[PDB]
């Protein structure tokens, strides 16, 4: 579980969004596993604006932050789950690292700020949904 809080926006995994989220929906892309909802209070996270391929992510299933190298955001085939059938997920970055389903929402961060959230994994890989192209999150 987990979210990004930037300005009056809340970014979550689409597959974990709540009632208030859909109600206050700003934007969602099923192919990216992303949903942005409006917030009352102002958030304090900074979104990275960069092409970094190294960073640190939070793994709730280890209570540990791991340094990782990750691929640039791309179209990647993701095995069927309880949330989606087998499909190409867009804007997805892979690293070698441990993850389990319930780690989704864990932040990936570089020196420039928030890069993305845990979205996919299995076979010793962890996938992260990029948010760095979502320029409107900053205004
Ligand atoms: C981080 N992580 N996410 C998922 C997942 O099913 N994500 C759905 C596409 C949303 C997963 C499955 C695993 F077996 C191991 C790790 C995982
Ligand atoms: Zn960066």
Domain ranges in the chain? 3-44, 45-139
Alpha carbon distance 111, 104 (integer Å): 21
113/101 Cα distance (integer angstroms): 24
Q: Is 8 buried (19+), middle (13-18) or exposed (0-12) by CB count in 10 A?
A: middle
CB of 118 sitting under 6 A from ligand 1? yes
The DSSP annotation for 53-91 comes to: -EEEEEEGGGTEEEEEE-PPSEEEEE---SSS-SEEEEE
Experiment type? X-ray
Query: 3-class SS at 95?
Result: strand
104 catalytic? Reply is yes
Judged by DSSP in three states, 50 sits in coil
Whether residue 124 has its Cβ less than 6 Å from ligand 1: no
For ligand 2, the distance from its centroid to the CA atom of residue 135, given in whole angstroms, is: 14
Pocket-testing residue among 99, 102, 106, ligand 1, by greatest number of atoms within 8 A of Cβ? 99
């Amino acid at each position: 579980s987990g979210a990004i809080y930037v300005g009056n926006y809340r970014v979550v995994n689409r597959h974990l969004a709540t009632h208030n989220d859909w109600a206050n929906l700003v934007w969602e892309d099923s192919s990216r596993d992303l949903l942005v909802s409006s917030t009352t209070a102002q958030g304090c996270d900074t979104i990275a604006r960069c092409d970094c391929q190294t960073g640190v992510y939070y793994c709730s299933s280890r209570r540990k932050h791991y340094p990782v190298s990750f691929s640039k955001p791309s179209l990647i085939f993701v095995e069927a789950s309880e949330y989606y059938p087998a499909r190409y997920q867009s804007h997805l970055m892979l690293a070698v690292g441990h993850s389990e389903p319930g780690d989704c929402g864990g932040i990936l961060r570089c020196q420039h700020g928030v890069v993305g959230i845990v979205s996919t994994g299995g076979n010793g890989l962890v996938g992260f949904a990029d948010v760095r192209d979502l320029l409107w999150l900053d205004e």
